[PDB]
Amino acid sequence: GAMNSSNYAELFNNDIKLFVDDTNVYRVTVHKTFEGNVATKAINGCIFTLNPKTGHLFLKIIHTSVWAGQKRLSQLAKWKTAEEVSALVRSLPKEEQPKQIIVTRKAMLDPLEVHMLDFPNIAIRPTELRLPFSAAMSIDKLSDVVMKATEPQMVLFNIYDDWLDRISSYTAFSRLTLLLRALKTNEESAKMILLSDPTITIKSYHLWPSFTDEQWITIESQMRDLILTEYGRKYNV
């Protein structure tokens, strides 16, 4: 059934599972034509498929050419997502295939279900959680590889860098979603917080800076404060 606050620790057990977020698959800019009508221009997008226990991210880059000559693109984007997720599962050895796939938006259930008919024992689940994975394109290195791509491409990352050497996956995921919540609510302030100190660098093979334990604590508190301020602002509380 659905994933919610109640059954949240299931994410960190040893049943393989993936989150799939399709929010950044079909991305456009809206502009005015010479005659003054509105038109869209597609830009490169990505599927965000993440194993929350291990940090493994399967970033499938969606090249604008996919859309060429197609109608009803926002509907097509859901089926392309499901096609690509299904291909990913097929590509994995049996003992690495997930037992559950949790889609972050309910509109993906039927497309994925249909694309996964060959895997009747992989459960396709919605979630009631309000996960911030749309802010993935606020991570500079992910946005850079998506925008530079000249063709369809799968790029693999560990979204937790090396954190798991020192913290559990429960704590890792809570840090990730806090960082992403912050980036979603106020990207400029969130990015300022992460980079202010030039002596804390991002390793070539990492996505986030190499904070010490104590510095992560200062960071997490600053992201919390960011998120609460913006809430009072939105609702005048």
């Binding site: 039927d110 279900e113 249909v114 008919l117 060959d118």
Partner: protein
Amino acid sequence: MNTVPFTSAPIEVTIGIDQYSFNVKENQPFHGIKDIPIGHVHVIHFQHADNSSMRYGYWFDCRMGNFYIQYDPKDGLYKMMEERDGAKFENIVHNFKERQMMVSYPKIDEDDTWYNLTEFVQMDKIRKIVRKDENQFSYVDSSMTTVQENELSDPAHSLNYTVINFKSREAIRPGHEMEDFLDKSYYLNTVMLQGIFKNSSNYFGELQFAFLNAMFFGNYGSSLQWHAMIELICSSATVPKHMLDKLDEILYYQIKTLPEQYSDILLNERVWNICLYSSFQKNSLHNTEKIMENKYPELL
């Protein structure tokens, strides 16, 4: 015109014959139904005055034998049986008419209702859905489950309707996932019509039989089956034109005949709203849409 005699009526019961019905009192001298139109299937059904649950009844065709009803006080219900002694049967039927202990099948001459509800229903196909090959007639009741229901327990007592499932390999060609899910024409025309039913008449016959079982017995799996077969057509972009026109007529008489008070459990809001207003065939059911809007605007 054919007759179905009754040995007796020992318990108070409401008896239906097709869309008509009569109240019979405990040990009232009722001895059958006469003037039954030859040429159509028919259904005789029962609801005991003491148990308004379990409506039950029998589908039959008088061309296939001489049939009668007898109460069984062990199993506690009115049973249908076949009399193989033609002479002995004409003798019973003539003496009961002489004594005028039979009700007449009360067909108005203008009325094609029953024809319209049963146009494609054949006894031979009913007996493949209700498998009990020692009898020429078929028992159905409120509680019988369908084969598809059983998959998601006793197979002898199952409704063996054709399994339709929109999220199945049968329905979805590999490589045409999106196309086949959004436009079920392949599933309808190649898999179901050409493959399984062979023609539209057999398809419509199962659809009509599912509806009648849902109406007369409140059989819930039959209602599910009727709606699935409607949805498959309406969700197909490419349907023979003769099928759409006949479907509009089929559905019209079914909606016309439904008891007004039962539209809440018998009509799936989602399917009807999708078929009439969203689907490929939204503009192809004009009679059915007009009677739905004027009789059941709430559901929409």
